[PDB]
């Protein structure tokens, strides 16, 4: 945001936006495996029996 605020040209904004979106893309690319693990735990915790310990 600061870089774009001090941007001076259309190509400047071009490459700045491309670079930022690339950073987020690479971050998710590394986050590839936690998403799979959390999807699996979500599926089971959904298909988990629900008891009442107090009753």
């Amino acid at each position: 945001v600061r870089l774009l605020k001090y941007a001076q040209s259309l190509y400047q904004c071009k490459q700045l936006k491309r670079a930022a979106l690339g950073r987020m893309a690479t971050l998710i690319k590394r986050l590839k495996d936690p998403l799979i693990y959390l999807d699996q735990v979500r599926q089971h915790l959904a298909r988990l029996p629900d008891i009442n310990p107090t009753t």
């Binding site: 600061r2 870089l3 605020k5 001090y6 190509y11 400047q12 490459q15 700045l16 670079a19």
Partner: protein, 87 residues
């Protein structure tokens, strides 16, 4: 305020390792001596970088702390500042 960068991504031509290291100072910007004096970081600009973390051993079995590194990207195009170390 924001446009300065404190550390640079230095790639070592030998040992094939890239590490983030602090910037010591700016020595020569070939585009403009005025940019050199101010400290402008353009493409191909040699700066002094602390390489204590790398731990390269020099002659007499001695270690080095500060070495030349050529900024080799266009930081205005891509904010991240990247240099190749000179060894």
């Amino acid at each position: 305020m924001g446009l300065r960068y404190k550390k640079a991504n230095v790639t070592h031509p030998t040992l094939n390792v890239t590490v983030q290291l602090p910037i010591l100072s700016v020595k020569k910007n070939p585009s403009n001596p005025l940019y050199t004096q101010l400290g402008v970081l353009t493409k191909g600009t040699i700066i002094e970088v602390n390489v204590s973390d790398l731990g390269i051993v020099t002659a007499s079995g001695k270690i080095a702390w500060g070495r030349y590194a050529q900024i080799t990207n266009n930081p205005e195009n891509d904010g991240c500042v990247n240099a190749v170390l000179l060894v």
